[PDB]
Amino acid sequence: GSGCDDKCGCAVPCPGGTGCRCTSAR
Numbered sequence: 410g411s412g413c414d415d416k417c418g419c420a421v422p423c424p425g426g427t428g429c430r431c432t433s434a435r
């Protein structure tokens with residue numbers, strides 16, 4: 410499902426999902 414990690418390069422307790430820059434990279 411969803412649930413970020415610090416390994417991503419952004420905070421773990423995310424603001425939600427899609428709006429975050431979590432997927433603006435490739």
Ligand SMILES: [Cd+2]
Pocket residue numbers: 413419420423424429430431
């Ligand atoms: Cd995030």
Ligand SMILES: [Cd+2]
Pocket residue numbers: 413414417418419420423431
């Ligand atoms: Cd993330």
